[PDB]
Amino acid sequence: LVHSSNNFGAILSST
Amino acid sequence: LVHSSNNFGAILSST
Amino acid sequence: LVHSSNNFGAILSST
Amino acid sequence: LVHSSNNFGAILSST
Amino acid sequence: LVHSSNNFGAILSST
Amino acid sequence: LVHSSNNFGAILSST
Amino acid sequence: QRLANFLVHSSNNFGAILSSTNVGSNTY
Amino acid sequence: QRLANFLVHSSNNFGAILSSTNVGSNTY
Amino acid sequence: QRLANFLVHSSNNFGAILSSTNVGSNTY
Amino acid sequence: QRLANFLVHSSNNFGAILSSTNVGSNTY
Amino acid sequence: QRLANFLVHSSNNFGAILSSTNVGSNTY
Amino acid sequence: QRLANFLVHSSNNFGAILSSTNVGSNTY
Amino acid sequence: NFLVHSSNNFGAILSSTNVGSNTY
Amino acid sequence: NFLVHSSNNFGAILSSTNVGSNTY
Amino acid sequence: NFLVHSSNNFGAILSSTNVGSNTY
Amino acid sequence: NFLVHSSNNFGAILSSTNVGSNTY
Amino acid sequence: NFLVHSSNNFGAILSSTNVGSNTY
Amino acid sequence: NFLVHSSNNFGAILSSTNVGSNTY
C-alpha cells in the first residue's frame, strides 16, 4: 500500500 | 492499492 | 506500507 | 513501514 | 520501521 | 527502528 | 484540504532524448 | 492540511539524454 | 499541518546523461 | 506542524553523468 | 514543531560522475 | 521544537567522481 | 593537381552563440 | 586539374544564434 | 600535387559562446 | 607532394567561452 | 614530400574560459 | 621528407582559465 499526500517531488517505488 | 492526493510531481510505481 | 506527507524532495524505496 | 514528513532532501531505502 | 521528520539532508538506509 | 528529527547532516545506517 | 493562491510549474520526462548541434564552418 | 501563497518549481527526469555540441571550425 | 509563504525549487534526475562539447578549431 | 516564510532549493541526482569538454585548437 | 524564516540549500549526489576537460593546444 | 531565522547549506556526495584537467600545450 | 584556397577578411565580425536553457 | 577558391570580405558581420529553451 | 592554403585576417573579431544552463 | 599552410593575423581578437551552470 | 606550416600573429588576443559551476 | 613548422608572435596575449566551482 502506497499513500502520498501533497507530493511536489518525484517518488519512485520498486517492488 | 495506490492512493494519491494533490500530486504535482511524478509518481512511478512498479510491482 | 509507505506514507509520505509534504514531500518536496526525492524519495526512493527499493524492496 | 516507511514514514516521511516534510522531506525536502533525498531519501533512499533499500531492503 | 523508518520515521523521518523535517528531513533536509540525505538519509540512506540499507537492510 | 530509526528515528530522525531535524536532520541537516548525512545519516548512514547499515544493518 | 484547503489550498489557495499557489502557482505550480511541473515538468516530467520519461523518454530518451538525443540532441546534436553544430554551429560554425563559415569562411570569411 | 492548509497551504497557501506558495510557488513550486519541480523538474523530474527519468530518461537517458545524449547531447553533442560543436562550435567553431571557422576560417577568417 | 499549516504551511504558507514558501517558494520551493526542486530538481530530480534519475537518468544517465552524456554530454560532449567542442569549442575552437578556428583559423585566423 | 507549522511552517512559514521559507525558501527551499533542493537538487538530487541518482544517474551516472559523463561530460567531455574541449576548448582550443585555434591557429592565429 | 514550529519553523519559520529559514532558507535551505540542499544538494545530494548518488551517481558516478566522469569529467574530462582540455584547454589549450593553440598556435600563435 | 521551535526553530527560526536560520540559513542551512548542506552538500552530500555518495558517488565516485573522476576528474581530468589539462591546461597548456600552446606554442607561441 | 593544383588547388589554391585563399580567404581574406577586412571587416569587424561579432558572433554570439547561446546553446542550452533546456528544462527536463 | 586547376581549382581556385577565393573569398573576400569587407563588410561588418553580426551573427546571433540561440539554440535551446526546450521544456520536456 | 601542389596545395596552398592562405588565410589573412585584418578585422577585429569578438566571439561569445555560452553552453549550459540546463536543468535536469 | 608540396603543401603550404599560411595563416596571418593582424586584428585584435576577443573570445569569451562559458561552459557549465547545469543543475542535476 | 615538402610541407610548410607558417603562423604569424600581430594582434592582441584576449581569451576568457570558464568551465564548471555545476550543481549535482 | 622535408617538414618546416614556423610560429611567429608579436601581439600581447592575455589568457584567463577557471575550472571548478562544482558542488556535489
Residue numbers in the entry:
A (entry chain O), B (entry chain R), C (entry chain L), D (entry chain I), E (entry chain F), F (entry chain C): 16 to 30
G (entry chain P), H (entry chain M), I (entry chain J), J (entry chain G), K (entry chain D), L (entry chain A): 10 to 37
M (entry chain N), N (entry chain Q), O (entry chain K), P (entry chain H), Q (entry chain E), R (entry chain B): 14 to 37
Task: Cite, word for word, the article reporting this structure.
Islet amyloid polypeptide (IAPP, or amylin) is a 37-residue peptide hormone that is cosecreted with insulin and one of the most amyloid-prone sequences known. Although the precise link between IAPP aggregation and disease remains uncertain, IAPP aggregates have been shown to be toxic in cell-based assays, and genetic and animal studies implicate islet amyloid in the progressive loss of pancreatic β-cell function. Over 40 different proteins, with diverse native structures or in many cases intrinsic disorder, form amyloid associated with human disease, yet all amyloid fibrils share a common cross-β architecture consisting of a continuous intermolecular β-sheet supported by networks of zipper and ladder-like interactions. Amyloid fibrils have a similar cross-β architecture, but fibrils formed by a single protein sequence can have diverse structures, varying with time, self-assembly conditions, and sequence modifications.
Virtual screening, ThT assays, and biophysical characterization successfully identified two widely used FDA-approved drugs, canagliflozin and doxazosin, as inhibitors of IAPP amyloid formation. The majority of fibrils formed in the control (69%) and doxazosin-treated (72%) samples were classified into three related fibril structures (named LL, LLU, and LLUU, respectively), which have a shared structural core consisting of a pair of protofilaments related by a 21-screw symmetry. Each protofilament is formed from a single stack of L-shaped IAPP subunits, with straight β-strand segments encompassing 13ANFLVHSSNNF23 and 25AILSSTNVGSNTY37-NH2, hinging on a turn at Gly24. Thus, out of the fibril structures that were identified in each data set, YX-I-1 fibrils consisted of 89% C-fold subunits, whereas this subunit fold was absent from fibrils grown in the control or with doxazosin.
